[PDB]
Amino acid sequence: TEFWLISAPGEKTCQQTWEKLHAATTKNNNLAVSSKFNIPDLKVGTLDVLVGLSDELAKLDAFVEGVVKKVAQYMADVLEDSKDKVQENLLASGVDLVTYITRFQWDMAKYPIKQSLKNISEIIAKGVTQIDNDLKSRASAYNNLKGNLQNLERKNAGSLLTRSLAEIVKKDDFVLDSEYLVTLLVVVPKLNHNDWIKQYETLAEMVVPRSSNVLSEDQDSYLCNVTLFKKAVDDFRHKARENKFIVRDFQYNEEEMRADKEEMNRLSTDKKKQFGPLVRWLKVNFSEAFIAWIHIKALRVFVESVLRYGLPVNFQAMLLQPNKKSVKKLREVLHELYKHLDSSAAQQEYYPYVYYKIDC
């Protein structure tokens, strides 16, 4: 979604229509969509200040463009009102970007027209700077939450060989409050499930026969609990390993499992609670970033137009919505229409008129 922003010297009033309405001469013979660009009438002093401003604005432009695209990607990562294949951008001014740009207005609320450009630029720069820091910090904190939540999901992921037992083991799975006995959980591949049941009773001296049962099963193995004499556990786990059974390092612990369950429940709720305010925060920041973005471009237009054509500052600036495969024709038309003013001052960027691209 690319739009072209241009400005003509405006010597004659026909320029208002030549850039829009003159089907005989206008864009793709009046096939490209164009609209009026609303610009404030601001004060200029000497040409060197304008030169400074041009440099400053080019830098501010690049900065904000980066910031607004970054935050757009942040929301893409959030997956709310903007995706990479659909919903390519967010609303600006409460309208879609296509609508915003097409009916783009100067935000005099933020940039009073009675101020000098230096101050206007400084004000915008400060706004977008604050927005950048606010959302960078917020996004980082959110990403850290997402990180920890995924970390817990992974911790509670996997098969019985590695999966956390918080959701598997019950108090009724362990032999508790025994003086001599401990209950161990061992994973026996399902192919050898009966062998475990047959073999566990004879793996070590002084084990409790017929005590073996199954706590859980998965596609590869069964997790079984066995109660045994504490001192035989070394022989039990040793010989179990010899018969290719894997014992888990687990003992019943109500507090750790409860803590894990609530921590996951809390982090998921926290994710939802931040999401709520996340999308409102980021969408507002986007809106403002996009508004400022175009404001910056408008100022770049003002500065270049005045710098090249002099004052009074009456120029005919217009927006185009290029049509597919007509870029060449539009450039040829614009060149023939305006080449006589510069002949050589303005490939990669230099045209005989004020020209910027909008990358959407």
């Binding site: 032999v175 409050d177 025994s178 003086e179 001599y180 017929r210 005590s211 049962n213 109660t227």
Partner: protein, 67 residues
């Protein structure tokens, strides 16, 4: 039969607990008796020394008397 196994083992644990608690109770009682007997011997010693003192005290007073 997992519950019968543990039933037997916990009953054995119960018996062990009773056995050691009773042994500790015996210890406590024996130690009290030990203190009582020690104190009895202390009193026997006290009586013996008190008797020698009083015997000597009366002899000493009579000796002091004649001088």
């Amino acid at each position: 039969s997992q519950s019968q196994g543990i039933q037997q083992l916990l009953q054995a644990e119960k018996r062990a607990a009773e056995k050691v608690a009773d042994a500790r109770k015996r210890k406590a009682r024996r130690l009290k008796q030990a203190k009582e007997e020690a104190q009895m011997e202390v009193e026997q010693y006290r009586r013996e020394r008190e008797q020698e003192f009083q015997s000597k005290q009366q002899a000493a007073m009579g000796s002091q008397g004649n001088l």
